[PDB]
Every structure is written in C-alpha cells, then in structure tokens.
Amino acid sequence: MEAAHSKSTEECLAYFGVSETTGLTPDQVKRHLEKYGHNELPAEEGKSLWELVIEQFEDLLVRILLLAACISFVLAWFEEGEETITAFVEPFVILLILIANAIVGVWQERNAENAIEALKEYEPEMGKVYRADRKSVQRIKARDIVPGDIVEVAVGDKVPADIRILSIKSTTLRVDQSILTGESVSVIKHTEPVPDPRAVNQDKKNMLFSGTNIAAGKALGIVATTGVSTEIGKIRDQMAATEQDKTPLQQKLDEFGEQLSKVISLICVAVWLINIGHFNDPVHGGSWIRGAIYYFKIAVALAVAAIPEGLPAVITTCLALGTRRMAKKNAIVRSLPSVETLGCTSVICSDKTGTLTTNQMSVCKMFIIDKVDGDFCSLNEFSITGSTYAPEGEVLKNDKPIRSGQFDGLVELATICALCNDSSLDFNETKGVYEKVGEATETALTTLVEKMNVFNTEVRNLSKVERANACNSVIRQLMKKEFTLEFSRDRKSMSVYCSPAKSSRAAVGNKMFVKGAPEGVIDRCNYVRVGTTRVPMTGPVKEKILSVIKEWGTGRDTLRCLALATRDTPPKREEMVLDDSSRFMEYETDLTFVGVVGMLDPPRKEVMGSIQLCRDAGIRVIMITGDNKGTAIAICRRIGIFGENEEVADRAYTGREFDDLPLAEQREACRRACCFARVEPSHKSKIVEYLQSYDEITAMTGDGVNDAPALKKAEIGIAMGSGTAVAKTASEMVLADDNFSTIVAAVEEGRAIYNNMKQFIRYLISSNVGEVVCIFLTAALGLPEALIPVQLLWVNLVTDGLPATALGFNPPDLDIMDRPPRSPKEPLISGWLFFRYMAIGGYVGAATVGAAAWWFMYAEDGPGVTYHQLTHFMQCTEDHPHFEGLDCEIFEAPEPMTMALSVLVTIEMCNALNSLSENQSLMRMPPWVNIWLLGSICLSMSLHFLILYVDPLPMIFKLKALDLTQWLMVLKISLPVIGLDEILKFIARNYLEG
Numbered sequence: 001m002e003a004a005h006s007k008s009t010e011e012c013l014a015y016f017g018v019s020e021t022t023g024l025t026p027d028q029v030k031r032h033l034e035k036y037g038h039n040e041l042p043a044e045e046g047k048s049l050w051e052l053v054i055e056q057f058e059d060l061l062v063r064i065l066l067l068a069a070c071i072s073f074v075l076a077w078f079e080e081g082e083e084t085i086t087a088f089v090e091p092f093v094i095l096l097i098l099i100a101n102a103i104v105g106v107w108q109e110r111n112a113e114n115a116i117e118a119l120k121e122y123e124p125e126m127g128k129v130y131r132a133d134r135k136s137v138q139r140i141k142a143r144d145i146v147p148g149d150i151v152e153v154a155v156g157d158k159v160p161a162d163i164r165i166l167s168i169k170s171t172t173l174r175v176d177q178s179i180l181t182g183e184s185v186s187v188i189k190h191t192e193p194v195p196d197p198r199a200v201n202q203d204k205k206n207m208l209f210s211g212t213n214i215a216a217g218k219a220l221g222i223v224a225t226t227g228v229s230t231e232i233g234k235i236r237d238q239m240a241a242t243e244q245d246k247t248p249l250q251q252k253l254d255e256f257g258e259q260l261s262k263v264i265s266l267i268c269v270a271v272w273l274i275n276i277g278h279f280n281d282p283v284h285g286g287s288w289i290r291g292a293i294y295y296f297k298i299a300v301a302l303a304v305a306a307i308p309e310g311l312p313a314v315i316t317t318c319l320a321l322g323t324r325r326m327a328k329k330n331a332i333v334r335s336l337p338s339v340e341t342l343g344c345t346s347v348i349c350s351d352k353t354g355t356l357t358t359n360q361m362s363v364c365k366m367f368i369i370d371k372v373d374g375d376f377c378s379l380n381e382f383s384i385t386g387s388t389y390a391p392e393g394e395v396l397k398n399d400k401p402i403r404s405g406q407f408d409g410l411v412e413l414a415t416i417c418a419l420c421n422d423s424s425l426d427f428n429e430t431k432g433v434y435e436k437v438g439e440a441t442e443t444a445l446t447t448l449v450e451k452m453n454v455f456n457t458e459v460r461n462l463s464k465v466e467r468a469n470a471c472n473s474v475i476r477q478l479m480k481k482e483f484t485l486e487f488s489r490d491r492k493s494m495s496v497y498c499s500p501a502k503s504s505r506a507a508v509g510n511k512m513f514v515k516g517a518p519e520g521v522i523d524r525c526n527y528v529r530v531g532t533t534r535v536p537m538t539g540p541v542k543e544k545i546l547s548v549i550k551e552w553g554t555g556r557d558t559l560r561c562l563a564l565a566t567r568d569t570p571p572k573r574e575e576m577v578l579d580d581s582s583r584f585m586e587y588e589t590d591l592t593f594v595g596v597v598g599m600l601d602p603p604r605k606e607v608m609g610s611i612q613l614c615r616d617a618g619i620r621v622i623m624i625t626g627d628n629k630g631t632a633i634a635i636c637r638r639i640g641i642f643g644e645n646e647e648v649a650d651r652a653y654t655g656r657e658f659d660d661l662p663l664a665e666q667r668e669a670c671r672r673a674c675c676f677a678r679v680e681p682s683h684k685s686k687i688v689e690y691l692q693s694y695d696e697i698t699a700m701t702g703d704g705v706n707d708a709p710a711l712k713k714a715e716i717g718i719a720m721g722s723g724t725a726v727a728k729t730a731s732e733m734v735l736a737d738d739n740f741s742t743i744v745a746a747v748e749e750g751r752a753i754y755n756n757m758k759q760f761i762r763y764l765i766s767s768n769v770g771e772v773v774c775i776f777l778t779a780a781l782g783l784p785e786a787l788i789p790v791q792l793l794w795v796n797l798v799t800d801g802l803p804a805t806a807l808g809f810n811p812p813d814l815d816i817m818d819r820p821p822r823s824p825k826e827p828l829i830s831g832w833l834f835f836r837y838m839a840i841g842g843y844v845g846a847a848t849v850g851a852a853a854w855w856f857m858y859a860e861d862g863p864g865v866t867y868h869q870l871t872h873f874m875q876c877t878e879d880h881p882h883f884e885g886l887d888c889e890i891f892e893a894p895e896p897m898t899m900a901l902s903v904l905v906t907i908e909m910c911n912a913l914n915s916l917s918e919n920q921s922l923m924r925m926p927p928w929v930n931i932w933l934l935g936s937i938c939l940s941m942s943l944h945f946l947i948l949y950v951d952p953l954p955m956i957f958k959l960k961a962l963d964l965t966q967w968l969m970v971l972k973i974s975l976p977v978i979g980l981d982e983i984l985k986f987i988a989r990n991y992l993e994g
Ligand code: BEF
Pocket: 178, 181, 182, 183, 351, 352, 353, 354, 624, 625, 626, 627, 704, 706
C-alpha cells in the first residue's frame, strides 16, 4: 500500500478489503503472499568466493610482480637447452610468496567478518496477527506476515512490518524509533491521516516501522509494506547501491605501482634502443636466435631486476600488524588498507543518538527543599554520575558523595520514582549489559533508585541479574500499588494509588504518588515537603522551585525535567472512578511538592576529549542527526563542536532548511556548517558526497540503519558495537566497546603506518636500484659478474626484508598528532625522494663493482691483473700471451663475489639506519633509537657469516670467507653511504625547506 500514512483507517481497510475485526482470510493470505512475497530481506550477499582471492590481486604491485614472475618464466623456460631445473626457483618462490600474501589478506577479511558477526543475537523473530482462522491472537514468524493483515503490538515488541495504526488500545502509545530516525525520546503515535506532502518518517506519527520497538502501550495496525519495501528495506537497498572507491592508501600504492611500471618500461627500452643497431656480426649462429630481438630479452631481465621482490609482503606485514594493534583496543578492521584511512581523514562526520550519545536516558540532577523561612527558600540539589542504565554511580552534593538515605526528602523522591513507574531494568547476560524494560524515561528512574539506594541495602553479592531491580524491590515492599492513573495529554502526569503494605509504620495513609510536567504538577500543590514535615506552598517557594526548573531546562544543561509530588490524604477508592481519564486531573490535586529530576540522553564520556584531540590534529567533526535541532545543538555544545555561547547562525541546518537551499549553496553549507538535524538517511550521504567533492577524505560514525548509506559512502565507516546490524556491515571499522577515543587512536596509528611504509619503500627500492645499476655497469664495462641472480633473491627477500619489516616499529614522532592531515594529491614518492634514493642506488651500484674490481686489481690475496685483462677476461685462454700467469678460472674466483655481496649487505645494513628518519641525522636520532632494527641488523649479518662459514652454503652460493683486511675494505666502502645520505638529509632541511 502506497503512503498508508496519508490515508485513513477506513481507506486502508477498504484498500485491502479486510475486517479490523476478523483479519485476512487464508485465501487472502495465500494471494497476498504470492503477490508480495515473504516479509524479509534477500539472502545477504555475504558469501565471498575463493576467487575473491583474485581481489587480493588487484594491487598493481602484485600484478606488476606477477608479470615479472611470468616474464621470468617465459624468459627462463627453454632459453638454453642445457638448463638445469634449479634456476627457475625465482618465479616459483615469487609464486609461493604472492599466493601467501594474497591469502593472509583474505584471512583478515573473514577473521573480521565473524568477529563482527559474533556480535549479533538472536536466531528468529516473530509477530502477532489476527487472521480469520482463530478468533484469538497468533504468534506467527515475521517472514510469513503479509501486507494487509492485522497485527497487534505491545510494550517491548519489535515491530515486524511497516504498519498503519488502526486503534490504540492503551490510553497512549509510545515508540522507540532511534535505530531508524535517530530520535532521542520515544514518540507518541496517533491514528489519523498525515496529509503533509513533504512529510517524513518522523512526521508519520500514525505509522509503525519495522525494526522499531514499543516503549509503552498496545496497538492494532494493518501491514502497509513488507520485506524490501519497508523503510528498513529501502535503506538497505540504498546502501547497497552506494558505490565505493578503493582506500586512499591502496590508491597511493597503485599510483606508485604505476610510477614503477613506467621506469621499468623506460629501462627495457633505453637499453634495447641503445643496442639493436649494434647487433651485426653477433656472433650468434650457433646460438640459433634472432638478435636485437634477443637483446630485448636482456632489457626485460633488467626490468624484472628493478622490482623489489619482498615489498608486497612487508607492506602486508606492516598493515596486518597495525590491524592487530587496533584489535587490542577493540577495533575490528574489515580490510588491511583500512587501518590507514583514518590517519589521513580531514572530516569525521558523526551521528548523534547512540553514536556521540549512549541513547540511555540518565538522571543527572535532582533537587528537594532544604529550608523554608518565610521569604527564604533553599534547596538541596544533587548530581548523579553515570551515563547508561547500569546501576553504577554515585550521588553527590556540592560535587562530593552523600548517602541519599540521610535526607528524608530523597527517601520520598526515591519512593515516588519506584512506585509511580510502569517500567523496570534487566541484565542481558548474553550481551553483558543492563537494558531498559519499557520506557526509557521511566527506566532512568529505576536506575536512579538503584544508584541512590535510599535504605543502604547490601547489594554487593548479587548477580547483575538480581541487582538490576534490588533497591526498587525493597521500596515496593513498603506499599501495595492498588491502581494507576495513566498519563493523559490534558494534564501531562500520572500517579499510582498506594495502600500501606504491612500495617507496620503505616499511618493508614493510602497515598497517591504523582509525576509529570513540572508546572502542571506544581499548580496542583498546596504544600511542600521539607524532610518529613509539610508546609504551605508560599509564593517565593513556587518562585524558587520554578526558577531552578527553568535553569535545568535550558542552557548548559538542557535536561528533561519532571516534578514529583504526593497526595498526603487521597480520596477513598470507592469515590474514585477509573474508566474516564478526564477525572484524573482532579484526583491529583491538593498535593505536596516533593522534588524534581533532570535527565537527558547523555554524551559518551570519551567523546568530548576525542573531539578536542581531533581538532588538534586538523580534523573537523560534523554532527549529522535525524533527531531534532534543539537536542542536536544542546549536544554539540556539551561536547565542544560549538562553544558555551557561540553563535550557530548559518552553522546549523535542519533537513527542510538544507533541502530548501539550491545545490550550489548546499555544497557550500557543508563547508561551514557542523550540525545537521532532522535529516533523512539520504542527507547523511549527500553531505559526505559534498565533502568528498572538495577532494576531502571523510569518515562516518554511526549506529542506526539511517547511518548505513552514509557509512558505505565515506572513505571509512565506523560503527558502534551496540549499533544495528546494517550499520556494521556497511562500515569498515567497528568499535566493539563503543569507545570513541579508539577513533583518535586508530587515526594516529594510521599516520604512523603511512610514514613507516613511505620509509621502507625508500629503503627496499634503492636496493633494487643498486642491484640493477651494478648488473648494468658490469655489462657496459665488460667485467665478470659481481653478483648473481640468486645472491640477490636472498638479499632482497631475507637480508634486506627483515630490517625493512623492523622499520614498521620506527618510533612515531610526537609532532605527529600536531600536524594537519597530509594533502590528498601529494604522492607517495616525490621527485626529490626519487633522486634521493637513486643517488643511494647509484653509489650502491658503483661500490659493489668497485669491490669485486678492487680485488682483481689491488687485493693482495688475488693476483693484480690490469684493467685491460679484466675487461677482456673472456678472451683468456690456456696461457694466452696477454694473460700471462693467470688462470682463466680465476675470473670465477668466489673472492671478488663474496667481496661484492658483503659490500651490498653492509651498505644495506648501513643504509637501514639511514632509513630511521627521513631527515633527522643519525646524530639526532641515533642508531640505537630503534631496537627492533638492531635486532634485524645483527640477525642479517649473523645469517651472512653463516652462509660464508657454514659448509654447504659457500658452495651453493659460490662464496668464500673474507679475511680481516678484506672486511676492513668492505666497511671502508660501505660507511660513506652514511656520509652520503647524511649530505642529502642536510640538503633537505637547511637549503630546501630551511
Ligand atoms: F541518531 Be542519529 F543522531 F541520527
């Protein structure tokens, strides 16, 4: 049924042709069912195939390396008939690496999914219909409910479908709609058409929305829509139709992955282009190949050389590591790149109710009368700590602790609160939390009484289950509740008639205990209580009470206030008639004013600090709430989004106001404004979209189904653990404990993760630049190999790979949470950092060659050949005239090679230290700053001397121990890489940004 809300009860019955009295017929059911389907959602798209392992392979860095792993295989297979099948173990181990890395990826994806999933209860949910089968009610499963049928709901029921209320059986029906609309206080429903054409869900006061619950009352309705067509369904689709780019980190990597893809392609050319016209008289005939087409093959062999084999693993090790650090602070992260997103966020958008707030009505102030001396009236005002329904907290007066029991006025106040109450408390053993039973604004009082513990009852040993209503039980023992005078919109109050229970200390007073809107109640008071005594309601008293009430109702604390009284001398039960609520106002008169209670849906305690921390880190916070504007701002003020008496002129907008703006101005308003109230789920998203249109990286934080689309839209959606199931599946982060300060932590985490990466990318890559420059110098000068393909595979993956990993523990600067968020366009590697590590890669290249060469020509351990012999060693023959005294085998000596490897390592172990700080001298931050680095350094060297001295290794790696003076040379060559880098760091602090 379309817009049942705009119709009438009759128009709606008519439309389906049904009886409010009997309900649908099984034939009507049968049809209605086949026409509309089962009131439910489609099977969650939550089943990712193992071919989503092919999503772990969308990273240009793995793609790149997979090409270099298949270009190696296609350039390794059959390329020399005389090949021993043990040179293929590069592409093979590249496989086993990527296979693994692409898997530890999918591990966290489901490791996350079923942690988040662990947070849901129950198995099924159900409803209550009247069909023409039985004259009575029927507990039917929620799915089997169809449009058209007659449902009944009572306090505590979750509304099964979207329903058009037909008849309110209780005097008054209240609905908790916070999961859907963000509304702080349950909403009073009526049964009349909502004509309004611009009318929104929070205006459909004659409708009951699936997902929502009953705070009070009982009602009969007719199902308007079901499954996907509910307000719950619509938003579900809306959320799934929202598209998403890749994380900003993944984007930065793919941006880099393509910069690398360019240089690799630039080299394959450069070298090939430089030689094709020089292949003539090759002499290749025996070799059976076409050349300047085989020269190509060596060009790509250089390409593959430029790829840091070990990179995608260290990255995926850095992240996974940071994910696990967040999980100890109780943050489930769905995907690895997501642990960064927050580190570079410019704006955090945040929902209010249940996000910034607990959505648990709390009494935090209360007063009674202290003294009445003629024109003088003093009050006893108290405060209560606590922010949830949990009976945990203390009562203060003047900010220090009291026993409520010590004030008889507090004893009565407690008593009214216990007795004049249709609700209770309950501990949910499964979720491990206390929860309201009934109406939020009533349970606030239940909780308050438990905290107050007015009789000093021992409660220590009680299960949280038994403790929930303990103190209230004790009070309910003093007086039998004989009946209740239900609320009514005319007087806005209620009361209970109570006879004393045990004939002990009972003055026969059949008291009535009363509560309601303050001045309604106060105007019917003649006396006021002062301890156990009573006195006339003088005028200055009435002025004193009311002045404080107006205070509490406004400004700094914008509390919902409630006046409490008793009729000391109630009528007799006989002379009082109940079937007419219009009598009630009169029964509640001649009253004794007792006290007042102030309550609100309070901010979560961490929030305010968190919001300041963010601000100190250059991040805006914006509130987007479906709740009303007044409560929205009040809350913005308490938490610091706005200040004490700051003007929020054009800085706060409702949904209507915003929608009235022209699109150009809407986008503009999202730039200045920080409070949007009364918004639809759609707005929440549109606003994020608007912020993203300033190239701004934004987060979203929420709990209810109305945050879902906005949560899917943000670069990160953060969901509260106690939030709806939709909000969680749309988010990428989930605060299991609702601790808003994790956000401030998950962020500074994600700034450290970027810096470490950026750091160990500069380190690993200069390696492959050195390794490449060396293989190129060797071919251009015509010297023997200084380093072989395998010696490098090991260096890259292991020797280098560990110190790279232990860069992920570089102590984060303290200035880190002082700087703004990095600029969106600013790339990972700049044209300076490039030159910078290419100068390292440069030197490294030269040095390793120098090493092997210095041995051939000057080392006292190895015959000092001339540059000419070394350059023409291929022409060496059995005692050639030009190679006098030499053994041609000497050009394969393991000494120049051991000499060349050691220089690499010792420069990489050396340059690892240089990789401690982008610009801070090794003087400032010393070698010993990072300890987990020095651990790697020594383990690397340890595994070096291992390969040299461990029998089987020297042969398989083609190496031989180095003597002292030799190592003495290895160092002389490697140290200056420091002095070199040191010279670069100076350049980039005293001359550039200076
Ligand atoms: F519940 Be939110 F504030 F919309």
